[PDB]
Structures are given as C-alpha cells and as structure tokens.
Motif scaffolding. Structure first.
Motif, PDB file in Angstrom:
ATOM      1  N   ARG A   1      40.559  48.008  28.498  1.00  0.00           N
ATOM      2  CA  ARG A   1      39.329  47.461  27.934  1.00  0.00           C
ATOM      3  C   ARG A   1      38.149  48.403  28.136  1.00  0.00           C
ATOM      4  O   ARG A   1      37.358  48.618  27.213  1.00  0.00           O
ATOM      5  N   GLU A   2      38.010  48.969  29.332  1.00  0.00           N
ATOM      6  CA  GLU A   2      36.900  49.851  29.662  1.00  0.00           C
ATOM      7  C   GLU A   2      37.297  51.322  29.655  1.00  0.00           C
ATOM      8  O   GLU A   2      36.665  52.128  30.340  1.00  0.00           O
TER       9      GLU A   2
ATOM     10  N   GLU B   1      43.779  43.975  22.228  1.00  0.00           N
ATOM     11  CA  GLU B   1      43.003  43.543  23.382  1.00  0.00           C
ATOM     12  C   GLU B   1      41.820  44.472  23.621  1.00  0.00           C
ATOM     13  O   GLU B   1      40.734  44.024  24.002  1.00  0.00           O
TER      14      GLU B   1
ATOM     15  N   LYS C   1      39.829  38.706  32.052  1.00  0.00           N
ATOM     16  CA  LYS C   1      38.489  38.378  31.573  1.00  0.00           C
ATOM     17  C   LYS C   1      38.370  36.906  31.181  1.00  0.00           C
ATOM     18  O   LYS C   1      37.817  36.565  30.139  1.00  0.00           O
TER      19      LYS C   1
ATOM     20  N   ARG D   1      39.651  44.844  19.632  1.00  0.00           N
ATOM     21  CA  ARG D   1      39.132  43.696  18.898  1.00  0.00           C
ATOM     22  C   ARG D   1      37.612  43.718  18.855  1.00  0.00           C
ATOM     23  O   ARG D   1      37.009  43.396  17.827  1.00  0.00           O
TER      24      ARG D   1
ATOM     25  N   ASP E   1      45.925  37.103  22.463  1.00  0.00           N
ATOM     26  CA  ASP E   1      46.606  38.383  22.422  1.00  0.00           C
ATOM     27  C   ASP E   1      48.120  38.242  22.439  1.00  0.00           C
ATOM     28  O   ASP E   1      48.819  39.247  22.288  1.00  0.00           O
TER      29      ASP E   1
ATOM     30  N   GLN F   1      42.022  33.468  19.091  1.00  0.00           N
ATOM     31  CA  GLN F   1      42.019  34.920  19.203  1.00  0.00           C
ATOM     32  C   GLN F   1      42.882  35.366  20.379  1.00  0.00           C
ATOM     33  O   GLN F   1      42.498  36.214  21.184  1.00  0.00           O
TER      34      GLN F   1
ATOM     35  N   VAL G   1      46.849  48.298  33.430  1.00  0.00           N
ATOM     36  CA  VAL G   1      47.475  47.367  34.359  1.00  0.00           C
ATOM     37  C   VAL G   1      48.778  47.936  34.901  1.00  0.00           C
ATOM     38  O   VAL G   1      49.148  47.658  36.045  1.00  0.00           O
TER      39      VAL G   1
ATOM     40  N   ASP H   1      39.048  39.093  36.539  1.00  0.00           N
ATOM     41  CA  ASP H   1      38.438  40.151  35.747  1.00  0.00           C
ATOM     42  C   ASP H   1      39.458  40.879  34.880  1.00  0.00           C
ATOM     43  O   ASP H   1      39.110  41.368  33.804  1.00  0.00           O
ATOM     44  N   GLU H   2      40.714  40.955  35.318  1.00  0.00           N
ATOM     45  CA  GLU H   2      41.721  41.670  34.544  1.00  0.00           C
ATOM     46  C   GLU H   2      41.929  41.023  33.182  1.00  0.00           C
ATOM     47  O   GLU H   2      41.955  41.705  32.153  1.00  0.00           O
TER      48      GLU H   2
ATOM     49  N   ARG I   1      38.134  48.826  39.435  1.00  0.00           N
ATOM     50  CA  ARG I   1      37.987  47.382  39.312  1.00  0.00           C
ATOM     51  C   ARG I   1      39.334  46.683  39.193  1.00  0.00           C
ATOM     52  O   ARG I   1      39.471  45.537  39.629  1.00  0.00           O
ATOM     53  N   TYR I   2      40.334  47.339  38.611  1.00  0.00           N
ATOM     54  CA  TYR I   2      41.658  46.732  38.560  1.00  0.00           C
ATOM     55  C   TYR I   2      42.364  46.833  39.905  1.00  0.00           C
ATOM     56  O   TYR I   2      43.070  45.906  40.306  1.00  0.00           O
TER      57      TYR I   2
END
Ligand code: NDP
Ligand code: ZN
Lengths: 95, 206, 125, 114, 295, 134, 86, 146
Positions: free
Chosen positions: E174-175, E279, B174, E282, D39, D37, E196, B171-172, E32-33
């Motif tokens: 991301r979130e 990241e 994705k 985008r 990163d 795409q 992270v 998930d990190e 979640r991380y």
C-alpha cells in the motif's frame, strides 16, 4: 530506606527490583522508576515505647473517629512490648 | 415501625380477587396465579395463551390494561424451558399493574404480541437478540442491540461476561478486526454467598 | 399443530460458541464441598457446573493475571444433577459427574462424656 | 416428543429452505464483492458461503435447521441492505489471525491447551 | 531463558511472545508491518526514532499497553544506539532512504549506520541481528544505492557474523514506492515481492534458529518484463496507457540467486502480484488481463 | 531434564492404599515450559517414530481401562478376592526371616515432615523440623 | 517376538464371568506354577464383560472375549494364547 | 503445609548437558530429539525406567507403552513389594482389603512393622476413632512408637 542494586536501580519498600538480566527495566530508560522514599517500617520504628500503668491499654490510632477501630492490648508479658495491630505503636507496662 | 415497609391488606385482597377472576375466565391458559407480599399480581400461563390472555387484559372492560410497560425474558438454565417471558402491563382506568408470565425453550417459537401492543415490536427484537427466543409472525425480527454479525445471545446465563471476540484496528489490513478475546487482567470471580441461611420463610423442603 | 422429533436435542450450532470451546472443554458437574473454615451448610444445596482450568499468566506491564479462556469464570447452578447433565448434553460439552457427598448421621450422646468404664470419658470440659 | 414447529414440519421441508437460502447467498456474493470493494474474489466469497453451509450438514432436527436458516437470512439481509460495513463482511475470513496448529506436537510446544 | 521472556498465552495481543525486539527504521514502509506483526503476538518492541513523536503515532495501537517503547536516537551517536539495544534479544535494522540528502548520503545510511548498529549490538550481547540488504546489491552496479548496499552487506557480516541478512526484491504494498511509483508516471525483468510476505519472513527468521548466519533472498513467485508490469499497473489503475538513481534501480534486472534460501525456506508462501495489485492501485482509480510472466 | 507437572497442575489419576481411583484437577498450570507428564511421553513417542495411540486425556484414560478397568472407576472401591490362591503360592517357596527387629523409617515426628521432593523443598516443613529438634 | 503379559478382566458377581471365576479358583495356581515368570494380571471390576488380553513383543496386543465362557473354554482360550506368538 | 514446596526448586525448562558437561536450558524440540535418538538405538534390557512416589497413572502407562514399543519390560518402582508367589497378579495381595472405613468394624487390629501415625496419619486417626468409640483392641509388632 531506599537502597540501590548493583545495576543501580532503587529497591522499593516491598523489596522489588528488576534483576540484572530482566528486559523489563527498559521501561525506565529515559524516564524514571517511581519509588516512595518514606519507608513506613523505618518510620514506625522511630516511635518511642509508651509506658503505662495497667495490664491492658486501648489504642485507636489517635484522632478519635479519624483513627482506627479501637483495640485493647494486653501487656502481661515482660519479654516484649504490646504492639497495636493497626498502627504499630508500642506499649509497655511500667515497673 | 419506622424501618419496616408497611403492608397493604386492602390492595392485597383486591389483586387476589382479580387474579381469581382472570383464572376463572381463561382456564384454558392460566396455570398459576399469585400475589406477592408487596402486592404485585402474577398470572402464569401456557405459551399458547399469549394472544388470548393479553387481548383479554387489554380489551375487557374490567381490565383495560392498555399500556405494555415492559416485555423481557429471564434465563433459568436448570429448567427444561429455560426462558421465562415476562409481560408487565399497566391499566390507567383502574390504576393497576399486572404481570403475565410464560415459558419457552431454545427451539419453540412464541407468538408475537405486536398485534396486541405495538410497543412489543422492539421488546421482542431485544429478546431475540439477547436471549435467542424466536417470535412467530413478527413484522421485522432481527438483532437490535448487538453488533452486526454478532454470534450468540449475550444475556443467556452460559454466555461469558466478556464474550468470545474483541475488536481492534489492524494497520496491515487497514480496518477494524475481530479476534479471540484475551484480557490483560482476568475478571476476578468472587464467592460471596454466606454458608448460613438468611431467610427461613423461603426454605425449600429437603 | 405439533410435529414429531426423535433427534437428541443438540443446539451447539445455534449457540454461537466457538468450536474450540465446545469440543476441547470438560464440564465438571458437582455439589460444592463445604468450606471447611465454617460450619454453615447453605452453600452445599445446589449443583454446579464449572469448566476445566486453563492458563493464567503474568501481564508484563503490571503483573496482573491474564487469561485467554472465555469460560474461566463461567459457573452454572442447577437444582438437580439431571438438570445439569441435560444442560451439558444439549450444549455439546463432555462432562464428569461427581455424586453428592452428604454427611452421614452421627450418634451423639452428652452422657458418654462421663462413662463409668468406656474410653469415651473425657478428661476435661 | 411432540413439539411445536418453527417453519418446517420435517427435514424435507427444512432442506427446501436451506437450498433457497443458499441460492440467495450464492447470487449475492458478486454484488457484495463489488459493493464493499472487497479484495477477495467472487470464487473466494462463494467458497466461504459453501464452507459455512457445509459445517452444519450433520443437523437432523428440523427446528434447528429452521433457526439456522432464519439466522442465515438475517445475515443476508444485513449484507444486501449494507447495514454491515466492510469490516463485518471480512470477519468471516480471519485475515489477521495466525494459523493455529492442529497436530499434537505443535500444540505441545506452544502451550497447555488441547 | 530468563523467566520474564518465557512465552505465555495464546499468541494474541495480551500474550507474551518472549521477543524483545529493537527495530531501527520502524517509522517507514517496512517498519510499520514489522512492528504490527511483533505487537500482534505480544512482543516487547523498542522503537528508536529520529522523527517527531507525531510521526510515530500510527505505531501506538499495535501493542498492548507497555509493549511499544519509543526512544530518541541519532544514527551517528553510538550511545543512543547502546541505550536502545542493551535490553533486547533481537535487533532489526530497517534503516534506509531511496535518495541522498545534504546530511546523509547512501554511504551513511547503508554502510556506516548499519555497521554501527551491528557493532553496538554485538558489544551489548544481543543474540540475534537481522539486516535488510537488497537482492540487486552489487559493488559494480550503476546505482550508488545498490553499491552501498553491497558494501554494507559485507560490513554487517564481518561485524556480526551470526546476523541474518535478508535481500528483498522491490517490495509492493500500500505504501510502496514501486506500484505507487509507476502509477504516478504521467529488457529489464522484475520479480517483486509482497510486503506482507517480507514481513512474515522476517518474523519467522527471528523464530528460526537456522536463520542465524544465513543470507536470504525474498522474491515473488513470478518474473515480469518491466514494460509488461507498467502496462499491467496502468490497466489496473484504469489509467490510459523521481531521481537518476531510482531509475537505475528500476532498470536493474532482478538477480537470480538459487544458492540462497528464500521465503519458502522460512515457511512463507510468496503472494502473486495479481492478488494484491488492486489493494494497492484502487486508490489510483478516478471514479484486466494480467501481465505476461517470464516462464 | 524434562520439566513435568506437579499434582496441583494436572488432572491425573492416583490410587490410594485401598485401591480407590481418584483424580486431581488443574488448580494452576505448570510453570515456565513444564508440561503435563503423559503428554511429554506422548510427544517423545512421536519424535522417536513409535507414536502412542492416544492424543487426549480421555484417550489415555481409555487406555488405562484396557490395562486395569478399576483405574477409571473414580471414588469406587473394587473388592479383590482370591486370598486363598495367593496364600497357596506364598508357601511353595520358603524364605527366612532375618534377625533384625522391625524398625519403621519414622520413629519420631522429626522424620514425618520431609519424605518426598515437594516437602523437602518446603520452607514451612524445614521450620517444623527445626522446631521439634530444637 | 513371543508373549510378554497376560491380563484377565472379570466381574466379581455377574454370571457372564462365572466361568472365569471358576478358572481362577481352580486353575490359576497351577497355571502360575508352570509359567512362573509370566505376568498374569487378574483384575476384577464390577459389571465388566470378561476379557483376556495378551501382549506380545514390541507392544502388540490382542483381546479375546470370555463372556459366558465355561471354565473349560477359558482354559482353551488360555492355551490358544500361551502357544501363540503374534 | 507442604504446598509451599511447589514454589521452590522447580524445573521450568528442558535441560541438556553441554560440551563442558553442565546442564543448560534448551527447547522442547532439542531435548526430545536427543532422547528420541538414544531411544531408537536401544532395545529390550538396554532401556529401563523408574517411577517415583508422586507419579500419576496416566504417565505410568504412557511410559510403559513407550518402553514396550522397544520391547523393554524393565518398568520399576522405588517402593519394593515381594514378587514371590502371586506377586502383583492378584490385587488382594497388595491392597488394604478391609478398606479405611472398615477399621470402624474391626474388633482386633494387629499392626506389623509399621508406624501408621506418620506413614498414614489419617488412617491412624481412624484407628484411634475406633479405639475410642468401639473399644477396639490394637496390638503391634515392631518398635514401641507412640
Ligand atoms: N522498499 C523496498 O522496495 C525495499 C527496501 N529495502 C530496504 O528495506 C529497508 C526499509 O525499506 P523502507 O521501509 O521502504 O525504507 P523507508 O524509507 O520506508 O523507511 C526508512 C526508515 O529509515 C529511517 N531512516 C532513514 N534515513 C535515516 C537516517 N539518516 N537516520 C535515521 N533513521 C533513518 C526512517 O526514519 P525517518 O522516517 O525518521 O526518516 C524510516 O524509518 C531499507 O533498508 C530499504 O533499503 C530493500 C529492498 C526493497
Ligand atoms: Zn493503634
């Protein structure tokens, strides 16, 4: 023959039980520890000894081909009974 | 004898006669000819003879092996040339099958047989993929069965059954990621061979 | 047309094995010992190659034996120790070779069981 | 010790193919980064290409070199034709893998493996 | 060490890390991380959740079978907390909300709940406690969010003296509600930190015996002017260049606290915003010279 | 206490009463946090600032060869000579025999079963000891 | 700081160790009487090139090759070590 | 049958004494730091080691090298062997020079101060094999063990 531990967890017929400091018992929180309560060791002990008139007897576990391979049990010793190695039924030479 | 497979001497003799026939016509390439007890004929050849021998069997009027049933490899690590290349051919004209075998190692190319049979295209791609045998002059040699970027040739005897890497969604980042394999339960190796010989007829000399 | 190559055959770079499972492994080349529970000798004919045993641990959920060793089950068979050594060398594994143990010829005599003046005489049959 | 060659008859011919493959990979990285795409940067992609080549710099067998080039061309084809997905390209970088310790003491603390 | 929690394996999915972690607030951005990294190395994770089980589904693939356990809990029920922590060796508190609701104000979420978790954890004998506070936490702030963080930070230290307290800047990812927050816009200096990096620091704080009793400040490598940050975000998002409390926090300059250890003191190297901005941003592009850092 | 490995848990070298070097193999790994015994000492040397010059099993075995070459000749019996020189040095200093008779430590089977720490911990050997004494 | 231990390695039969074998047969006993509390570990092993190892204080070591040495050169190499203090 | 001892009384974690004087589990880092601290503060005769009966050669030389680096030479074993004369300088002094298989070639065996039946059961079985098949003559000095 279900017995419980000081923590309260039921002890299985194989003697399994998590000890006091074992984190793994967290899996039972909110659910349950599946334990079968018909202990076969206690059930076979309730069967009576079968008296026979010969030194040798055969057991197939009952039911013919639905039982176990047929074995012959020697009953010459009078100190103990003859026990079937498959089903645990006991035999004794009478008189 | 109800439980025993019946022999067929007539077919054994016919296939033996044809095996000599091939050996006489292509001595340059044929190294061994044998007919099994269940009547299957094998021609063992030098790898240089793949194209001439296969072309002869396809085109010669007394062969006409127009169908390539299958093409595969066998890994035998104890051999200097570990890879055995097996061609299984079918002749509809004469209602017969023949097996052609050759050999190669990890670094010696084999001549692609696509010119003789168009069926060979994908079979040789699979041999390259699973065993790492390179076929020279193949129209498009590349992996066919394994994942993209897959490292190694799984059907080699020294490739582990469960591989080296496994996949999961992370998930990190994705995306699906590849990581070294760890198994919750190791595959349990069984030692099945009886210490007692089963087949005297195949005993090897001491 | 052939070419001349004098380099020692080395295929470590084209086999796809992770570097860890080439450099840090120790292959054992040997003929398996007869299982002492049986008299048959048919399992002592060929040479074997196995690798060093690594960690197995208990799976927290079930207690099953888990492993992170991809070569834990790999066992290869060879006709001769020379074939086994050659295979190990070209794959970059360091190895140990154990010479084959063959039972020595024994001198047997049923008549010795009844010797007139030797200790070999048996007291029971 | 007389063997059938693959493509190259000696190391000099083999090393020409290596250089040609490297040029193809070097020029493909910027397109790959954009197309997939990614990163990572173009420099990272080229640094990874160099690292993959460099680990095979000790080979002196022209047949082994030919196979490495053959496999490298297959990998390049999978990338240019976008048969790979993003996951496949990014597998070269081991992003989710924790740093494996190297020195004796670090390995001693964690387990038994050398 | 009890025999069941001795580490085994090679640090992967099927391994045994030896960590038994209860993670409160596991279903949010940071949770979640944290769960992912714990489950990566074979930790036992207990996830108390208030939400529907449907909302915890993204956490299931992050552990081998049996390694993620879900329990119902209520922040105001101390028995539900006790059930969740009494088997763990570490408790991680990530409970928070960027806004107040009719049922939970900033005092409930940043003072009463963290203190109740800390108290129940202490009673249950949990050895490690990790509490996330905030870099700008301050009793005299204009934001009631940051005021409650300060009071809660005090209570957690008093109730669980050996707790590791971690104070991040605004976290980008991301979130996040930082870069995404700006990208959705239709004096102050910030030092944002990558998600992270914060996660790695939390995991290392569990493995570091020195982390006990300490307060850390997790900040990024560079400081930016808020205006230059938003300008950078819009450029990356290819876009032509909310609550009252949220705006107060966004306008609070990130504090400079050299007297605290940071990510570097735990082995984590801070990630620049420039390497991860695309990241995150985008997805905001409808189908770039970096912000000027404060030197 | 530094938990080491038992002979079933390491590839280690033992020399039997003939002077024949043999090596065990790992059957299972050491339990818990236990470690290979030479690695413990190698790790201890690094922490104490006197790092030993070998990092692997093969390197520590190369060290054994420096000290005694026969220690890496597995399964071989290297003959020893110079009994005559040894017997010369045996005479130049004189000790007296004591009057005690020669009594071996194990006179009966009961003494056989428990002699080291592994067998002293074995419940099977305890059953053997009990069987022959009762 | 001085010597701690001497080790002599040789083969039982190879000619290259013949001079070492003579030294042991003829000189080791006298050398041992002079240095009574100094370990002189003689270790024969088949088909090794002969060698003389010297271990000094704090684990420093030096090795001198004795291949094809005469019994006299072996004595000299022994004396060079029994008076050195590396 | 002694292998079941390997499942009992095992040392699974490093232990150090606590302030109360009791052994308590700790990490490898901590246990070795305590040992290294003491090792650095001692030299020569102040450091000694004793090897037990099951120790392997790799550990035996590692420990010898470590103590030598603090200039210690007190590397001892539990089993005595007389160091008078040649001591351990000559291997033949402390070896079974005839070898185990060589017993089948001997015509007289003299046993001194030993009960080989329990000290070396398989060696004693080789003596019986030669006694049975070669008519070997065995004499003993010591207690008249069976
Ligand atoms: N994100 C940032 O920029 C920064 C965050 N922090 C702190 O880090 C922690 C996590 O941040 P983040 O993960 O972004 O917060 P999220 O809002 O993303 O996740 C919040 C978590 O708290 C739980 N939660 C909220 N209110 C309650 C409640 N009343 N009762 C029970 N559970 C509740 C949520 O569960 P549900 O989903 O069931 O509501 C969710 O799991 C918080 O303490 C936050 O203040 C500190 C500095 C910077
Ligand atoms: Zn029955």
């Amino acid at each position: 023959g279900v017995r419980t531990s000081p923590t309260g967890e039921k002890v299985t017929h194989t003697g399994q039980v998590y000890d006091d400091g074992d984190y793994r018992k967290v899996r039972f929180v909110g659910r349950q520890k599946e334990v079968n309560e018909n202990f076969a060791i206690d059930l076979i002990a309730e069967q009576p000894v079968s008296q026979v008139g010969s030194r040798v007897i055969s057991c197939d576990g009952g039911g013919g081909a639905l039982g176990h391979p047929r074995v012959y049990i020697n009953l010459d010793k009078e100190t103990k009974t003859g026990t079937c190695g498959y089903c645990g039924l006991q035999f004794r030479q009478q008189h | 004898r109800p439980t025993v497979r019946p022999r067929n001497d007539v077919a054994h003799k016919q296939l033996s006669a044809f095996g000599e026939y091939v050996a006489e016509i292509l001595p340059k390439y044929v190294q061994q000819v044998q007919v099994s007890c269940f009547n299957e004929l094998e021609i063992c050849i030098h790898p240089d003879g793949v194209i001439p021998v296969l072309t002869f069997l396809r085109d010669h009027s007394n062969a006409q092996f127009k169908s390539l049933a299958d093409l595969t490899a066998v890994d035998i690590p104890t051999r200097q040339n570990r890879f055995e290349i097996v061609y299984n051919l079918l002749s509809l004209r004469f209602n017969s099958r023949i097996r052609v075998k050759t050999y190669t190692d990890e670094l010696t190319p084999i001549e692609s047989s696509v010119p003789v049979y168009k069926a060979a295209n994908w079979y040789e791609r699979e041999i390259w993929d699973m065993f790492g045998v390179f076929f020279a002059n193949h129209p498009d040699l590349r992996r066919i069965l394994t994942d993209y970027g897959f490292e190694g040739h799984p059907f080699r005897k020294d490739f582990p059954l469960s591989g080296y890497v496994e996949l999961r969604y992370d998930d990190e980042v994705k995306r699906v990621v590849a990581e070294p394999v760890e198994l919750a339960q190791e595959f349990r190796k069984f030692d099945l061979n009886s210490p007692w010989e089963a087949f005297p007829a195949y005993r090897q000399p001491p | 047309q052939l070419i001349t190559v004098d380099e020692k055959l080395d295929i470590t770079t084209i086999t796809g094995v992770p570097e860890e499972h080439i450099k840090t492994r120790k292959a054992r080349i040997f003929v398996p010992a007869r299982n002492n529970m049986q008299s048959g000798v048919n399992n002592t004919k060929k040479w074997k190659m196995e690798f060093d045993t690594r960690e197995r641990w208990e799976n927290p959920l079930m207690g099953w034996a888990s492993t992170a060793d991809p070569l834990s089950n790999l066992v290869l068979t060879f006709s001769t120790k020379e074939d086994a050594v050659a295979f190990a060398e070209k794959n970059g594994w360091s190895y140990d070779v154990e010479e084959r143990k063959v039972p020595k010829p024994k001198s047997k005599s049923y008549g010795a069981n009844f010797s007139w003046n030797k200790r070999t005489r048996v007291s029971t049959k | 010790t007389s063997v059938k060659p693959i493509f190259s008859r000696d190391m000099n011919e083999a090393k020409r193919r290596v250089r040609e493959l490297y040029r193809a990979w070097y020029r493909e990285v910027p397109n790959t980064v954009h197309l997939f795409q990614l990163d990572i940067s173009v420099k990272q992609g080229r640094d990874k290409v160099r690292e993959m080549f460099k680990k095979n710099a000790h080979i002196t067998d022209p047949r082994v070199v030919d196979l490495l080039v053959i496999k490298g061309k297959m990998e390049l084809e999978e990338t240019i034709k976008v048969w790979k997905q993003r996951t496949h390209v990014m597998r070269f970088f081991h992003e989710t893998e924790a740093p494996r310790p190297k020195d004796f003491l670090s390995k001693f603390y964690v387990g038994h493996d050398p | 060490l009890h025999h069941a929690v001795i580490p085994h394996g090679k640090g992967g999915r099927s391994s045994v890390s030896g960590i038994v972690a209860t993670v409160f607030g596991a279903t949010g951005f940071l949770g979640r991380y944290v769960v992912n990294h714990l489950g990566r190395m074979g930790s036992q994770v207990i996830v108390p959740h208030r939400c529907e089980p449907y909302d915890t589904m993204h956490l299931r693939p992050m552990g081998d079978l049996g390694q993620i356990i879900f329990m119902d809990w209520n922040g105001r029920d101390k028995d539900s907390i006790r059930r969740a922590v009494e088997h763990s060796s570490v408790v991680i508190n990530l409970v928070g909300r960027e806004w107040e609701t009719q049922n939970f104000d900033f005092e409930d979420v940043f003072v009463k709940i963290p203190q109740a978790i800390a108290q129940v954890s202490k009673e249950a004998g949990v050895e490690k406690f990790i509490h996330i506070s905030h870099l700008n936490a301050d009793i005299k702030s204009s934001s009631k969010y940051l005021r409650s963080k300060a009071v809660g930070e005090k209570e957690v230290r008093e109730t669980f003296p050996e707790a590791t307290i971690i104070k991040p800047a605004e976290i980008f990812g991301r979130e996040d509600r930082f870069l995404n927050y700006f990208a959705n816009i239709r004096k102050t200096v910030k030092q944002p930190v990558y998600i992270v990096d914060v996660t790695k620091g939390i995991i290392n704080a569990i493995k570091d015996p020195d982390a006990r009793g300490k307060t850390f400040a997790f900040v990024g490598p560079s400081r930016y002017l808020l205006f230059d940050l938003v300008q950078y975000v819009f450029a990356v998002a290819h876009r032509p260049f909310t609550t009252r409390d949220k705006v107060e926090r966004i306008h609070t300059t990130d504090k400079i606290l050299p007297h605290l250890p940071g990510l570097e003191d735990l082995g984590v190297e801070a990630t620049p915003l420039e390497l991860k901005a695309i990241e995150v941003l985008r997805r905001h592009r409808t189908y770039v010279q970096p912000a000027k850092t404060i030197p | 206490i530094l938990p080491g490995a038992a002979y079933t848990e390491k590839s280690a070298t033992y020399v039997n009463t003939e002077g024949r070097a043999q090596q065990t193999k790992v059957a299972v790994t050491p339990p818990g946090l236990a470690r290979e015994d030479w690695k413990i000492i190698r790790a201890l040397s690094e922490i104490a600032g006197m790092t030993l010059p070998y990092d692997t099993l093969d390197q520590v075995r190369n060290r054994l060869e420096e000290v005694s070459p026969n220690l890496v000749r597995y399964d071989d019996v290297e003959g020893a000579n110079y009994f005559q020189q040894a017997s010369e040095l045996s005479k130049l200093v004189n000790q007296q025999l004591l009057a005690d008779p020669l009594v071996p430590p194990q006179l009966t089977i009961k003494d056989f079963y428990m002699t080291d720490s592994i067998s002293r911990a074995s419940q099977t050997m305890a059953k053997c000891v009990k069987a022959v004494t009762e | 700081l001085g010597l701690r231990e001497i080790r002599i390695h040789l083969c039982q039969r190879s000619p290259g160790s013949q001079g070492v074998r003579d030294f042991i047969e003829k000189r080791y006993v006298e050398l041992k009487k002079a240095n009574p509390d100094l370990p002189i570990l003689i270790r024969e092993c088949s088909d090794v090139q002969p060698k003389l190892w010297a271990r000094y204080a704090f684990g420093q070591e030096k090795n001198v090759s004795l291949n094809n040495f005469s019994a006299d050169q072996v004595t000299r190499a022994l004396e060079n070590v029994l008076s050195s203090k590396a | 049958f002694a292998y079941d001892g390997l499942k009992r009384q095992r040392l699974t974690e490093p232990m150090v004494r606590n302030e109360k004087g009791l052994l308590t589990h700790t990490t490898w880092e901590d246990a070795l730091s305590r040992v290294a601290g003491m090792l650095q503060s001692f030299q020569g005769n102040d450091v000694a080691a004793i090897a037990g009966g099951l120790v392997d050669a790799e550990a035996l030389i590692a420990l010898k090298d470590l103590l030598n680096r603090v200039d210690s030479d007190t590397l001892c074993t539990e089993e005595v062997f007389p160091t008078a004369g040649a001591g351990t300088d000559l291997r033949s002094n402390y070896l079974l020079n005839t070898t185990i298989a060589g017993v089948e070639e001997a015509d007289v065996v003299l046993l001194v101060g030993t009960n080989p039946r329990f000290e070396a059961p398989l060696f004693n079985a080789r003596i019986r094999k030669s006694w049975l098949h070669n008519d070997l003559k065995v004499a003993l000095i010591g207690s008249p063990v069976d």
